[PDB]
Amino acid sequence: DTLVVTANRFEQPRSTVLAPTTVVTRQDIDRWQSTSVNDVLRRLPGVDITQNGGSGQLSSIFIRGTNASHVLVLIDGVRLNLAGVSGSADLSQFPIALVQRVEYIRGPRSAVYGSDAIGGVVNIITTRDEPGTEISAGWGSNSYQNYDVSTQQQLGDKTRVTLLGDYAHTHGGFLSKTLYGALEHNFTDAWSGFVRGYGYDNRTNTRKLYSQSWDAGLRYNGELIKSQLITSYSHSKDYNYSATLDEMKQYTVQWANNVIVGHGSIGAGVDWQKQTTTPGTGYVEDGYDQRNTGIYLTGLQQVGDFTFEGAARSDDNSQFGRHGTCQTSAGWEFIEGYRFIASYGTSYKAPNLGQLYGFYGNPNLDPEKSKQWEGAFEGLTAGVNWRISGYRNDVSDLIDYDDHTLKYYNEGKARIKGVEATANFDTGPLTHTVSYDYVDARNAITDTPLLRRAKQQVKYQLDWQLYDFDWGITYQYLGTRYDKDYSSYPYQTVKMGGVSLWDLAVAYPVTSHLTVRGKIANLFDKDYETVYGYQTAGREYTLSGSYTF
Ligand SMILES: CCCCCCCCOCCOCCOCCOCCO
Ligand SMILES: CCCCCCCCOCCOCCOCCOCCO
Ligand SMILES: CCCCCCCCOCCOCCOCCOCCO
Ligand SMILES: CCCCCCCCOCCOCCOCCOCCO
Ligand SMILES: CCCCCCCCOCCOCCOCCOCCO
Ligand SMILES: CCCCCCCCOCCOCCOCCOCCO
Ligand SMILES: CCCCCCCCOCCOCCOCCOCCO
Ligand SMILES: *SCC1=CC(C)(C)N(O)C1(C)C
Ligand SMILES: [Mg+2]
Ligand SMILES: [Mg+2]
Ligand SMILES: [Mg+2]
Secondary structure, three states, rough: OOOOOOOOOOOEEEHHHHOOOOEEHHHHHHHHHHOOHHHHHHOOOEEEEEEEEOOOOOOOEEEEEOOOOHEEEEOOOEOOOHHHHOOOOOOOOOOOOOOOEEEEOOOOHHHHHOOOOOOOOEEEOOOOOOOEEEEEEEEOOEEEEEEEEEEEEEEOOOEEEEEEEEEEEEEEEEEEEEEEEEEEOOOOEEEOOOEEEEEEEEEOEEEEEEEEEEEEEEEEEEOOEEEEEEEEEEEEEEEEEOOOEEEEEEEEEEEEEEEEEOOOEEEEEEEEEEEEOOHHEEEEEEEEEEEEEEEEEEEEEEEEEHHHHHHHHEEEEEOOOEEEEEEEEEEEEEEOOEEEEEEEEEEEOOHHHHHHOOOOOOOOOOEEEEEEEEEEEEEEEEEEEEEEEEEEEEEEOEEEOOOOOOOEEEOOOEEEEEEEEEEEEEEOOOEEEEEEEEEEEEOOOOOOOOOOOOOOEEEEEEEOOOOOEEEEEEEEEOOOOEEEEOOOOEEEEEEEEOOEEEEEEEEEEOOOOOEEEEEEOOOOOOOOOOOOOOOOOOOEEEEEEEOOO
């Protein structure tokens, strides 16, 4: 199988991770011709993305019916800094040109990573191993324009340098400029070090976002033992124009180890994080300094037809103190190629600055808490790889605005019951990748459905190659959703009808160096919204190329 590092921080085959797992490579992203992260993500199981319009507009990610703030987004294994002020991940500003791989694991994972990993985890990896220089560019609808240069070069054997530059610009709009460098060095065959730095300057209509991140690390990859020590600094500055500045610095230091033992592994690590915000950030008066340290244990073992996986973690947070989480999954391969999996896991979400210290702050709030149970069957039948999972997620201690006392409190519960079905198979030269999600996400106290969430989704990718034309068709059904209408007070909840959407993409190797690509997004120009009142794109055309040398 393809490897992931996201389940326990170290490489393992994805057949040994029991939680459902999706991997997107750069090759997929080039064929899809995605011009944003959201477009990559909306394609995958359990993902419901809403957006205040097109590219660059604020967005929310609802994994498996959970709140916007209950997905953990990592960049190269570190909590996305853009999410630090608001406490909820928004990838609409993150440059797609940095995205080399996505590992997405559904279900909880606080027991490895701490806060936010309730619905699942999305790790965006920016590292590639692909020697050479490449030039790319695109033109499309709304004066869309992209230029991109990158290279990877040995500087002597043992060392290599990566550089990337990207400019993307789209009127009505959204402008984004990105720069990335890395140095990778192999001290021995087992020992390695790296320093990575990147930044992007975005403008959106007037919002002005700038972010930089620097990472530095040491890894040991032995025959049995693996170790990693990584430090990370991020600094973002977010201007809105009267005058609002949100600024945050995030520091991380993590040390993990993992050893192969019996038929599997055992791991442990320690994780430290500091976030400082500047006065006035998040409509909070003072600057804050929040700290967290966690310690966790992981395990995986195969015995006969059974697989057991687990993680357990204790976090010590400077505001709410101590919270412990744990996860266990057992799988049973009862006949060759078929498997039942049962999982249980707790996870949490930390209070955010606004909830804590804003005008309606409550400095004594506790984390939001999740308990999740999941059961799955997977199999390989007649060339079809498939899986069907049912899950229940009880969330409690939700942080809610109390209008009577003008303060946030822990109160309030949600019950989510869902089914995920996926399959992939070929029929002659055709490859089919399909998924179906049912999500019944409610307020558990009133029994009413949560807003902003599609109860059902169907997703289908159909790929094939005919001459030297490589074709991809993308279909999605976004089901019924409820939302509030803010044009009239009191704001009333409205029912937004299901919608089907189609994209067509093609690529062609003009020569061995030159690939040209075309896309039509929203082929039937379907008029729809994912947030009530905010119009989405309509039919758009892209045309691009890349040249390798
Ligand atoms: C009363 C319920 C609480 C149970 C918590 C027990 C924690 C689970 O671990 C039990 C001990 O098993 C450790 C196995 O370690 C896994 C890998 O190494 C063994 C290689 O075969
Ligand atoms: C020696 C302990 C190393 C493994 C501890 C990680 C497991 C976290 O605890 C979860 C409790 O679940 C009960 C254990 O049964 C499942 C086994 O988990 C896989 C470890 O082999
Ligand atoms: C590596 C081991 C991980 C497995 C540990 C999970 C087992 C938890 O056991 C029960 C916990 O009991 C909670 C203690 O009570 C304090 C708070 O609730 C009190 C209610 O009045
Ligand atoms: C390498 C060690 C990793 C151990 C982390 C264990 C995390 C266990 O968290 C499970 C939650 O358990 C519920 C009770 O925890 C509250 C603390 O209670 C201890 C004092 O009463
Ligand atoms: C919900 C879990 C699914 C459980 C039912 C599926 C288990 C099916 O087992 C099928 C065994 O395979 C029989 C197929 O025929 C054999 C193929 O050719 C073998 C060479 O002679
Ligand atoms: C391994 C089981 C996979 C679940 C597949 C769907 C089966 C549905 O049939 C049972 C009836 O469903 C009752 C309500 O379903 C919504 C619950 O979603 C699952 C979480 O409990
Ligand atoms: C899918 C339920 C029947 C047993 C599993 C068969 C293999 C699943 O592959 C399905 C992939 O396609 C999704 C279609 O889903 C319709 C059934 O959804 C389950 C509703 O509870
Ligand atoms: S959170 C890990 C877990 C698994 C199971 C054995 C069902 N448990 O009782 C706990 C809650 C320890
Ligand atoms: Mg212009
Ligand atoms: Mg070794
Ligand atoms: Mg408390």
